[PDB]
Design an enzyme around this catalytic site. Structure first.
Site, short mmCIF file in Angstrom:
data_model
loop_
_atom_site.label_atom_id
_atom_site.label_comp_id
_atom_site.label_asym_id
_atom_site.label_seq_id
_atom_site.Cartn_x
_atom_site.Cartn_y
_atom_site.Cartn_z
N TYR A 92 0.80 -1.14 -0.13
CA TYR A 92 -0.06 0.15 -0.11
C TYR A 92 0.93 1.12 0.05
O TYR A 92 1.96 1.15 -0.55
CB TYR A 92 -0.85 -0.07 1.28
N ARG A 145 -6.32 10.96 -10.87
CA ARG A 145 -5.87 11.58 -9.76
C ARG A 145 -5.18 10.18 -8.85
O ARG A 145 -5.81 10.12 -7.69
CB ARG A 145 -6.96 12.22 -9.10
N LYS A 163 -6.15 -1.95 -3.70
CA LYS A 163 -7.44 -1.86 -2.82
C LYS A 163 -8.25 -3.05 -2.64
O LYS A 163 -8.56 -3.20 -1.50
CB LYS A 163 -8.07 -0.81 -3.60
N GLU A 235 -12.36 5.08 -7.16
CA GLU A 235 -11.12 5.49 -6.54
C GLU A 235 -10.29 6.06 -7.44
O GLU A 235 -9.94 5.94 -8.66
CB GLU A 235 -10.47 3.87 -5.96
N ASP A 236 -9.58 7.26 -6.87
CA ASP A 236 -8.68 7.97 -7.57
C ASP A 236 -9.15 8.86 -9.00
O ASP A 236 -8.51 8.64 -10.08
CB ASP A 236 -7.20 7.34 -7.73
N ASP A 258 -14.34 6.34 -2.37
CA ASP A 258 -13.64 6.10 -1.33
C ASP A 258 -12.89 7.54 -0.98
O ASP A 258 -12.83 7.81 0.34
CB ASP A 258 -12.49 5.08 -1.56
N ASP A 259 -12.34 8.22 -1.98
CA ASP A 259 -11.53 9.54 -1.73
C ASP A 259 -12.49 10.56 -0.83
O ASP A 259 -11.89 11.43 -0.30
CB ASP A 259 -11.03 9.92 -2.92
N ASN A 401 -0.70 11.57 0.32
CA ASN A 401 -0.09 10.68 0.13
C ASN A 401 0.54 10.65 -1.43
O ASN A 401 -0.10 11.24 -2.24
CB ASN A 401 -0.77 9.10 0.09
N1 LIG Z 1 -5.08 9.71 3.67
C1 LIG Z 1 -6.29 9.23 3.20
O1 LIG Z 1 -7.18 8.49 3.57
C2 LIG Z 1 -6.51 9.88 1.76
C3 LIG Z 1 -7.44 9.79 1.04
C4 LIG Z 1 -7.80 10.39 -0.25
C5 LIG Z 1 -6.88 11.30 -0.87
N2 LIG Z 1 -5.87 11.54 0.01
C6 LIG Z 1 -4.50 12.66 -0.51
O2 LIG Z 1 -5.28 13.94 -0.44
C7 LIG Z 1 -4.38 14.43 -1.75
C8 LIG Z 1 -5.56 15.25 -2.20
O3 LIG Z 1 -6.58 14.34 -2.71
P1 LIG Z 1 -8.00 15.04 -3.32
O4 LIG Z 1 -8.80 13.89 -4.15
O5 LIG Z 1 -8.68 15.87 -2.08
O6 LIG Z 1 -7.64 15.76 -4.44
P2 LIG Z 1 -8.17 17.16 -5.52
O7 LIG Z 1 -7.25 17.14 -6.84
O8 LIG Z 1 -9.77 16.81 -5.59
O9 LIG Z 1 -7.83 18.32 -4.54
C9 LIG Z 1 -6.67 18.67 -4.47
C10 LIG Z 1 -6.62 20.04 -3.76
O10 LIG Z 1 -5.16 20.67 -3.37
C11 LIG Z 1 -5.31 22.04 -3.67
N3 LIG Z 1 -3.77 22.42 -3.93
C12 LIG Z 1 -2.89 22.01 -4.84
N4 LIG Z 1 -1.57 22.35 -4.56
C13 LIG Z 1 -1.89 23.11 -3.53
C14 LIG Z 1 -0.77 23.91 -2.85
N5 LIG Z 1 0.40 24.13 -3.45
N6 LIG Z 1 -1.23 24.79 -1.73
C15 LIG Z 1 -2.53 24.64 -1.35
N7 LIG Z 1 -3.39 23.99 -2.07
C16 LIG Z 1 -3.21 23.38 -3.20
C17 LIG Z 1 -5.89 21.85 -4.79
O11 LIG Z 1 -6.16 23.38 -5.11
C18 LIG Z 1 -7.22 21.15 -4.42
O12 LIG Z 1 -8.13 22.19 -3.75
C19 LIG Z 1 -3.68 13.50 -2.20
O13 LIG Z 1 -2.23 13.71 -2.31
C20 LIG Z 1 -4.26 12.16 -1.58
O14 LIG Z 1 -3.25 11.18 -2.03
C21 LIG Z 1 -5.53 10.91 1.26
O1 LIG Z 2 -6.95 6.45 -0.74
C1 LIG Z 2 -5.83 7.03 -0.81
O2 LIG Z 2 -5.23 6.80 0.35
C2 LIG Z 2 -5.38 8.28 -1.68
O3 LIG Z 2 -6.08 8.53 -2.50
O4 LIG Z 2 -4.44 8.71 -1.31
MN LIG Z 3 -7.64 7.17 -3.16
#
Ligand SMILES: NC(=O)c1ccc[n+]([C@@H]2O[C@H](COP(=O)([O-])OP(=O)(O)OC[C@H]3O[C@@H](n4cnc5c(N)ncnc54)[C@H](O)[C@@H]3O)[C@@H](O)[C@H]2O)c1
Ligand SMILES: O=C([O-])C(=O)[O-]
Ligand SMILES: [Mn+2]
Ligand SMILES: NC(=O)c1ccc[n+]([C@@H]2O[C@H](COP(=O)([O-])OP(=O)(O)OC[C@H]3O[C@@H](n4cnc5c(N)ncnc54)[C@H](O)[C@@H]3O)[C@@H](O)[C@H]2O)c1
Ligand SMILES: NC(=O)c1ccc[n+]([C@@H]2O[C@H](COP(=O)([O-])OP(=O)(O)OC[C@H]3O[C@@H](n4cnc5c(N)ncnc54)[C@H](O)[C@@H]3O)[C@@H](O)[C@H]2O)c1
Ligand SMILES: NC(=O)c1ccc[n+]([C@@H]2O[C@H](COP(=O)([O-])OP(=O)(O)OC[C@H]3O[C@@H](n4cnc5c(N)ncnc54)[C@H](O)[C@@H]3O)[C@@H](O)[C@H]2O)c1
Ligand SMILES: NC(=O)c1ccc[n+]([C@@H]2O[C@H](COP(=O)([O-])OP(=O)(O)OC[C@H]3O[C@@H](n4cnc5c(N)ncnc54)[C@H](O)[C@@H]3O)[C@@H](O)[C@H]2O)c1
Ligand SMILES: NC(=O)c1ccc[n+]([C@@H]2O[C@H](COP(=O)([O-])OP(=O)(O)OC[C@H]3O[C@@H](n4cnc5c(N)ncnc54)[C@H](O)[C@@H]3O)[C@@H](O)[C@H]2O)c1
Ligand SMILES: O=C([O-])C(=O)[O-]
Ligand SMILES: O=C([O-])C(=O)[O-]
Ligand SMILES: [Mn+2]
Ligand SMILES: [Mn+2]
EC number: 1.1.1.38
Lengths: 553, 553, 553
Positions: A92, A145, A163, A235-236, A258-259, A401
């Site tokens: 993962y 994404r 996943k 997902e993504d 999921d996200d 991540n």
């Molecule tokens: N830990 C978890 O369970 C989990 C789950 C889902 C997503 N994530 C992580 O969260 C991150 C974003 O996912 P998402 O689906 O929300 O993305 P998204 O593309 O839907 O949104 C990204 C957001 O980040 C902002 N952004 C980008 N660069 C920026 C910067 N330099 N400064 C300030 N804001 C900035 C964008 O404007 C946007 O609002 C990813 O890296 C993903 O791996 C973690």
């Molecule tokens: O699902 C997650 O862990 C992500 O999108 O980064």
């Molecule tokens: Mn994801």
């Protein structure tokens, strides 16, 4: 199983290796095709760990273990179960992100179903090509994404694959009832377009209505063959599409993202545990997100659902949540666009317009900070110091991540706030010991704590649609497992090493919720929900392949 | 190809990976099961070399490449073909020996047919379990004499598997017509008997008549199902059994012993090339063997055949040959036993009986030295320096395998002799550059230069039994392809890099020989043997799997 | 379909004979295995009628047409469809009875699932042996009451086999989703126990709790592999077990008994049609049964449901019904036993006890008579003449099967009453023309008019349990299709030649009732029911077996 002879060894679902008993070998036409030695899964497990131990790189380990899934499925899962916490970082985040960005160079065998824009009008024929006849769960991606790596196109199939491994490793869902899928409509990744090893269509992303129709054609094909309540986890997907398809299909099919919703539940659960130590007055909470997308808006929504249930009106709650994206702080009348979802959290500009996230923290004076921008180390020492200056016990969540895109490290969080912060991260980090001898052990705020158990509950209950309150319940169900001792160590979540039982427990609570709110259709209704769930989990132990032979009276 | 669907992908014999055409995919039911990209073997080969280049150790490489054989057979041989010379040390000696010793640790999938003493009375049913129905070539072992590693039991299956890869990689023999076999009657190797990963029966070797009866039941079973003219090559059997099984079957079945006869042919060819530079008066030749077993006695019988056919008498030829085993020099009346095969070369002791091999050299003053004891560096500097002193151009062959069991090295040989020696080795050694600037390129006197081409011929001509003259002939066919500029470099054999045509050429020449002496039963007789042979060679290029579709008038 | 080659022709489910198109033959590997001629199902149909026309006996015809079911399924059903009314007497009653009684002499291939008492404890392994994985309907018997023939043991498998043909031939239920089952726990038929061709266990019936376990194990085994809502139709079980199993299972599984409930609805429908011509005051209705078993109690009970529905009360309705069995008139206090079910129709003896069925008729003077004793021509001339004297338009139903067991013929009924009787039979009888010129076309009162259409309704609705009121609705949906014209000819039921549409129409009425009474679970619910059903019927037209080949952009 109807097959006999070598075909039994070629199919990883059935291949037991030297674990095939002598009777099985003789009765199933395998005598001679295997060495004269009869082994046990335990011996096989030993061979694995011996080998893995000698390996040096995480990607090399990834290729070795993911390969077992293609040789002996039972042993594959046994190996993860032996020590899930130690293999999680390989299988993962963060190694999975590396494997994805390298998918074409390490390719040996394909995994999952592939549907391209070039197959439009013929998606049902592709679905019918899948060998398994009783799929129950699907995890699909279009690869735009991938974690915080962005658009990886078809190289992103690694995500749906990994996943579903957790579906089985964490919640005991049958591997043959799972189906990972990748939708290839092209990729805007210039480097991949110039890559000879790329595995998808060499063209930019088709964003026309053709795209929407392909997806629609896909949902129809899947449910036409496997059933209307087949679980479909998105997902993504890119921001725009992720929200669009969720709103479009959630009341029509049994689906969730999921996200958006899984991440919503884990974050809330960590926020709940944190409150257990802070006990801060609700009128005082003030959350500030870095990033304002899928995850941010999903978390913000579950938080409001909780505050509302804890008093506050929906509108009041939203006022407590702020967001700062790549263009700056989301305030009314700002030049940068604000979508329909961000709207509720977009408020009147404060006394001053913050230029940097540090300015925001200072002006807004938030109690909690949540990183989900996928843009790297944005929670700088200055930001971390400011939070500790502003708060006695600041809550710092860096959820992006893979590890390299995270907002800060556990060590950075604890050392810069003198061990006063309550921290959580999306990717793994080990314990932190400060120059003063204190040791803090952080928990991982990742949706893997949520999707496995929620998926098992819905599947078992023959549930037709997944409402948001189903994730609110999962959040509560996960946090209710945290013990004071663990909380004491700094964990805002139960230990990852116990993720299997934690999942099964979440499943039980969720199925109790579905049946209670008339969202279950499996009949008859089980009396003992816990015994019902535990009774139907897939086990990694070998099954006997012998035919039923018996004498007649 | 009667199969369609996933099965086409699970069977390495048919799997093409992303090389399956879009039309092959749509028509065979594979659309969706593979990524949208259509690849060429050329690209697949590129992925391999890129990956292999990153790898550090040979056993890791051996595991990687031998695994391809279990995923995509065609790409496997394409990979070998791309550079047989650089991969031979990994796929063959020495690394093949290291892999056998590590067999139980690296196991993932079995290869070949396994028959054990416990299966006596049921060999036929085990033989009927093999999937392919038109086997033409079998290489069998019992693991008692694996290279110079000794009794390795079932771990010695890596030997036949490897020999058969060369059957196809060197002579273009069809993979699906090849069958590796391991006879398991136990092992006397204490270490293995207490090894939990051992792949065979946990018992000491059964050497009763029950051993013989099993071999009997094996030969009969194999020929009952595949035909009496099926090629059966014995490999790495213990001395006593190797000789008696050859005598016992050579006129009943189509069988030969690679270690005895194959080695004889390659050794003689190197000796024939050396003489091209030495032009030594036949009467003066004096050959001393280090060891007197399977290899030693075979080479010696062929040397005599060459001599006799060049003017000497049988008796007069065997007198130019001396052997020194673990007990010392073979002389008349010595305590150490002397077998029937040894008598012809066991002479009345000399003035003084040598105690060490160095003594036997200085007393007998040989012109040629051939190491075939498999006991290590017994060709010490003193021994090498004695030959350089006794002969202006000493002939030194260190044929023991693997490399660690070799009597000496190329470096040692040339250096200590000041570049005056004609050296050959059983295992690979790079070129040696003396401090005076001269550089020497040693040839590899290994039976790999012989068994492939001889097998091809025998198979194509439907030959029933193999005579020793076939090998004498094959020895002639090999050396005849050696060029001056090559001999000039110091090679007593053609460059390994062209082992493909060398083998094809040898095959053409042996089929001519078999027809001429009426040993070939393939009818009718090809007018152009060259064309005939080159016509029937298996290729690594992918074949079209498309059904024959066509319009009717 | 995933198979190709000869298997396609060997499997009747797919075999098309010369109907396989050229492109199908080439892409699927049949080129050369079929004659060069491409035929149409029409040509094949012509070949059939041609050969049947030259045949003599009905059994010879049965063997021929039932054999087609094992060679080409698609064609088998096209053949029935061509003219169901003319084939029914051969495929159904009466010839099916002759077939069964002859089952062991005419055997060629088995049909269905066989489960013996000797397999107690291993029934699930048997169920898992059935090739189809999506069964939706089962028809099962133990062969104790085969028609009016009695106990025929395993020879009774013909019945369940024939019933399912009609499931498809009448209501378009997919053949692969049907499964005939025979429970062999022995047979009390002394003749069969002496028959060297008998096909079952040579032992008298096991009537112990073991019998009950087997059936229980059978119901669980079936539901576990195919689902809790799988239709299980009981047929031709002995009196005791028929009622006990129905009661025991109607609430736990989705099951019903054809002989009890199916017969109930057909008979009610015919009675309903008669009432159209008679217009008899509900107060004067007086029914007397000849027989008191499964069918008699089933009809009486549905009869009451109607009267009660039409005003009367359950108590007074039941008083209008009387029964007469092999012991006599069912009167309270009688010597012979009166069971739980007979209770409501066993009334206080009449001033005079009737010794014979004629006396019975004379004393009770009923308006209607219903034979269901399966013991021959018990509706004697005097009995028919009596009914004519007592009644202006006597109703005479002789439902016992097969024809030789019927109570009287159509010719007997019409002639003996001078065309005043309203008659119906269980077996087929052709039109009757009296000496005076009037022609009368009788209707057939058989459950075939009911079970096909109900089954389809239930299956399509994902119905879990079947209520008696469902059969009341079927009885109405059937009779509601009668035209005054057909009624004018003397038919109390729609013409047999129309059974197909009459079934679909009944199925459409029932799914509306099921949904309307919240008994349907399929989701979502269909707006237009008729369109919903018609859209889901199986057709005997060949389907294209070509792979989905298409060009990519
Ligand atoms: N830990 C978890 O369970 C989990 C789950 C889902 C997503 N994530 C992580 O969260 C991150 C974003 O996912 P998402 O689906 O929300 O993305 P998204 O593309 O839907 O949104 C990204 C957001 O980040 C902002 N952004 C980008 N660069 C920026 C910067 N330099 N400064 C300030 N804001 C900035 C964008 O404007 C946007 O609002 C990813 O890296 C993903 O791996 C973690
Ligand atoms: O699902 C997650 O862990 C992500 O999108 O980064
Ligand atoms: Mn994801
Ligand atoms: N080999 C097969 O195809 C096969 C084997 C066993 C059961 N089944 C199916 O299961 C149904 C019978 O119900 P049941 O006894 O399985 O339980 P159940 O009815 O209590 O379970 C409810 C649903 O959850 C699913 N399920 C149960 N455990 C699962 C798991 N560990 N992983 C993924 N999905 C799981 C079931 O398929 C079922 O649709 C039948 O409809 C049958 O089609 C099919
Ligand atoms: N290069 C090739 O093509 C090729 C082919 C076959 C065998 N070989 C090698 O030749 C070696 C021997 O194989 P074999 O089949 O002849 O074995 P074998 O057991 O039949 O004979 C070995 C002989 O060496 C003698 N010996 C052992 N230790 C000795 C010592 N310390 N000093 C002197 N003599 C000693 C033994 O007494 C015996 O006579 C093996 O290492 C094998 O790998 C090479
Ligand atoms: N799919 C099959 O099982 C299959 C297919 C083709 C041919 N055959 C067999 O081949 C014979 C017809 O002769 P032919 O036209 O193949 O060649 P051939 O008659 O010219 O060759 C003589 C023998 O050499 C063998 N042979 C040819 N090339 C070989 C190779 N590259 N590797 C291993 N063995 C090889 C053949 O099996 C044959 O027995 C028939 O007896 C038939 O049974 C079998
Ligand atoms: N090859 C297969 O195994 C296969 C193929 C197609 C559909 N299915 C199954 O059908 C369900 C999807 O619903 P749907 O689109 O078929 O229709 P549906 O959901 O509208 O029909 C409702 C139920 O009636 C059954 N049904 C429909 N026609 C039938 C017929 N002619 N004879 C007997 N039973 C019939 C269906 O199996 C279904 O369970 C899924 O559960 C899927 O597993 C299986
Ligand atoms: N036409 C249809 O749709 C249909 C459907 C089901 C059954 N049947 C027929 O009805 C007949 C009986 O079936 P069942 O299930 O009711 O059987 P059953 O054994 O349950 O009942 C038979 C009844 O007839 C009585 N009886 C027997 N001999 C008699 C005699 N000689 N005189 C008067 N009464 C006598 C018995 O006492 C008993 O009450 C069978 O021949 C069967 O073929 C017809
Ligand atoms: O035995 C050996 O060493 C060989 O065959 O190369
Ligand atoms: O049982 C019977 O006679 C019937 O169903 O027709
Ligand atoms: Mn050898
Ligand atoms: Mn019946």
């Amino acid at each position: 199983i109807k097959e006999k002879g070598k075909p039994l060894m070629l199919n990883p679902r059935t291949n037991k290796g030297m674990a095939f008993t002598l009777q099985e070998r003789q009765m199933l036409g395998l005598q001679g095709l295997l060495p004269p030695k009869i082994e046990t899964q335990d011996i096989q497990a030993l061979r694995f760990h011996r080998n893995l131990k000698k390996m040096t790189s995480p990607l090399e380990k990834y290729i070795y273990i993911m390969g077992i899934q293609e040789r002996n499925e039972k042993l594959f899962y046994r190996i993860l179960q032996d020590d899930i916490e130690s293999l999680m970082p390989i299988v993962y985040t963060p190694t999975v992100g590396l494997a994805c960005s390298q998918y074409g160079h390490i390719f040996r065998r394909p995994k999952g179903l592939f549907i391209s824009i070039s197959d439009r009008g013929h998606v049902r024929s592709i679905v019918d090509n899948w060998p398994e006849n009783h799929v129950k769960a699907v995890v699909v991606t279009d690869g735009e994404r991938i974690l915080g790596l962005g658009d990886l196109g078809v190289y992103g199939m690694g995500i749906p694959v990994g996943k579903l491994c957790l579906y089985t490793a964490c919640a005991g869902i049958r591997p043959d009832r799972c189906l990972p899928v990748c939708i290839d409509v092209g990729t805007d990744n210039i480097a991949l377009l110039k890559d000879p090893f790329y595995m998808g269509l060499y063209q930019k992303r088709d964003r026309t209505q053709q795209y929407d129709d392909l997806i629609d054609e896909f949902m129809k094909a899947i449910t036409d063959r496997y059933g209307r309540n087949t679980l479909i986890q998105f997902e993504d997907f890119g921001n725009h599409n992720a929200f669009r398809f969720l709103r479009k299909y959630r009341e029509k099919y049994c689906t969730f993202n999921d996200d958006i919703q899984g991440t919503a539940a884990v974050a809330l659960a960590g926020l709940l545990a944190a409150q257990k130590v802070i006990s801060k007055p609700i009128s005082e909470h003030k959350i500030l997100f870095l990033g304002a997308g899928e995850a941010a808006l999903g978390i913000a929504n579950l938080i409001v659902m909780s505050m509302v249930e804890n008093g506050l009106s929906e509108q009041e709650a939203q006022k407590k949540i702020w967001m700062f994206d790549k263009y700056g702080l989301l305030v009314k009348g700002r030049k940068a666009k604000i979508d329909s979802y961000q709207e509720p959290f977009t408020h009147s500009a404060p006394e001053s317009i913050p230029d940097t996230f540090e300015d925001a923290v200072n002006i807004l004076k938030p109690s909690t900070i949540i990183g989900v921008a996928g843009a790297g180390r944005l929670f700088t020492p200055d930001v971390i110091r400011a939070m500790a200056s502003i708060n006695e016990r600041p809550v710092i969540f860096a959820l992006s991540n893979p590890t390299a895109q995270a907002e800060c490290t556990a060590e950075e969080a604890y050392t810069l706030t003198e061990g006063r912060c309550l921290f959580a991260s999306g990717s793994p980090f080990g314990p932190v010991k400060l120059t003063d001898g204190r040791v803090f052990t952080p928990g991982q705020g990742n949706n893997v704590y949520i999707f496995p158990g929620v998926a098992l509950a819905v599947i078992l209950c023959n549930t037709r649609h997944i409402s948001d309150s189903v994730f609110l319940e999962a959040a509560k169900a996960l946090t209710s497992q945290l013990t004071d001792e663990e909380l004491a160590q700094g964990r805002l979540y139960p230990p990852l090493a116990n993720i299997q039982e934690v999942s099964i427990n979440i499943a039980i609570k969720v199925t109790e919720y579905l049946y209670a709110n008339k969202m279950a259709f499996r009949y008859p209704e089980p009396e003992d929900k816990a015994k019902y769930v535990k009774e139907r989990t897939w086990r990694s132990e070998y099954d006997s392949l012998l035919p039923d032979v018996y004498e007649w009276p």
